[PDB]
Amino acid sequence: DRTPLVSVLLEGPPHSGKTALAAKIAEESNFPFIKICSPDKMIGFSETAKCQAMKKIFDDAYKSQLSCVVVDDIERLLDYVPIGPRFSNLVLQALLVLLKKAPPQGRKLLIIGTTSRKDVLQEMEMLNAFSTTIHVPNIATGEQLLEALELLGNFKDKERTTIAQQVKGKKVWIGIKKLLMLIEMSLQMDPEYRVRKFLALLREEGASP
């Protein structure tokens, strides 16, 4: 009763699987009003149109005893580009004002945000408007890689042994989505060179933090 409005930020390295987890968290809450505000439905719009669209969704969220609105890929909403820098200010101000406006008496809300560049957000005075943050990590240890491979269930046993032998004595820095992509890319060779090319691709992609 002393906190009708909450917020949270999910951030981490790219290709790490952030939007899926936000969608799952929203799905498994049993609230009666769940909505997603993504930036691929606003291709070609101007600043004012984006403001009006976000405002309309939030306005609709104020007529229900419970709600959950997801706002993903903030940096695309702002139109950030490292050169300059250059972005949109009006959308930023609207977003910074909508994050601490309470609903009418007796109603509740919950906002989840997603991003991949936390420092730039910190510069613009935006980590002060959120209530907490969570961290989504990349795959770190080779045993996790083997577990993910087995759960996906793609490579056979002896191939698993070779991969484990050559990938269990070092470090690994790979995202899950990129892992799916690499597996599918490697599966197109003849049945003899599959493991060799998978190892080559993993070695090439393997980059220091």
Added chain:
Amino acid sequence: ENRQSIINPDWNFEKMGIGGLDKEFSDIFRRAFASRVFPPEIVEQMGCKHVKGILLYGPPGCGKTLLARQIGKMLNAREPKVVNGPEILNKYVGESEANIRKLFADAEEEQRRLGANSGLHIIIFDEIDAICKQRGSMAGSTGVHDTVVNQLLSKIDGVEQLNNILVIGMTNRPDLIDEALLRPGRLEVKMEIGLPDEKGRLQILHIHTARMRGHQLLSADVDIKELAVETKNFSGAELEGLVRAAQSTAMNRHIKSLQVTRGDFLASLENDIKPAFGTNQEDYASYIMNGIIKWGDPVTRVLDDGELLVQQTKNSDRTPLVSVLLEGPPHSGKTALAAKIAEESNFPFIKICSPDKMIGFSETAKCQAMKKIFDDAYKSQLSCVVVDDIERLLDYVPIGPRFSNLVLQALLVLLKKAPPQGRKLLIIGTTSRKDVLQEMEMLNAFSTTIHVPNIATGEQLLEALELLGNFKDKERTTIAQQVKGKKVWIGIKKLLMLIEMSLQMDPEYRVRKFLALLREEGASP
């Protein structure tokens, strides 16, 4: 008197003249008009109103109006009132509403004169999404067409009830229409009319060749299975046009047994009909000119990689969207290799997007054009879209730097949007400045990169000269001895220019000029 005779005395479905839709009609019949044929006693006892309109959306040319007229002619209704969207608007105050208010007059009159025993009236709209758009709310920012929508909403479902009307809307942009115009009270049933598959084309050809078959004017070699398999993404209009062109070409041939034959259909298909959701040879003929000769291994490597990527995007389901980037030094012939990789794919739908057709456009128009190409690409089951120059779209220029930001965001959002369920796509890019693209953090959107190298040895140059075939053996020996040192670094679009600039010199002051030009060009990595 029981009004169970709304159904016309005799009706078959397939005889109507429509072929290719069999679940759309089934669902429409079940959900909409199952209460216009049941005996009036039960309908009256249960006390239920009737559906008051429907919406139809899909591509342009797939037979929407035909279905509306057939629906109307089913229910013994009166003559439909066909209207057009942009033909209602007017410049004076109080004219558009007057036009919109003159369609519901006869229904109201006949409701007055005979209450509850009147006949169905039908109204057919067209491009409905040109008059009705979402209404604004901010004070002082209300739109300019906020009275037409009000005057239509207040009439479809108002304070005085009309129970003898049915409204059908047709549009191609289902996402621009208002939200208060689609609640279960008005225009509640929505249907999609999509491109036909093999069975659809087979039935559409049977229907349109029934007349010729009956009149004994078809030869005994023309078979419809192969003509159905040949046409890939044809709509209905382009099938009827094909049949008509075939008959006309046969008649013209007769002028010099007037029975059409395989050859007539094949010629008409090849040279008369061009689909709008299919491949076109004009682009390949215009971009790949002077052919693709081989002068080394790199060409083979590039083509092999392209083939592998095509196979992956075809035969996988975990990743229904792929991308790739071809980058190399300027003048190295990148667009031709891209258009070649696309032409060997054997995909139903191929299209090229280049800035040659957007001279003088403001950035918003460029966004619209790119978006329209992708929107069309999302309607097929396989596709391949090429983006020609990823630096002339942004308007990059080293001073500043200066460029456009709207187009860049549109492009960065369109490289990660997957197509509707169960469809596939492939994107090929091309650029000469990898580093600048890397600075804007767009070089990690593309899945993979490929390199297009340059001439780097004497024997490669000699083999290119041999393939082009312009000099004699003694001249070849002279050039080989003069440029034996392997310090050659030239493009493959510039070598043709150097050759052609020298050939028009003089009988034997040619090779001297060619060598001088080759030396002056320089060689750096």
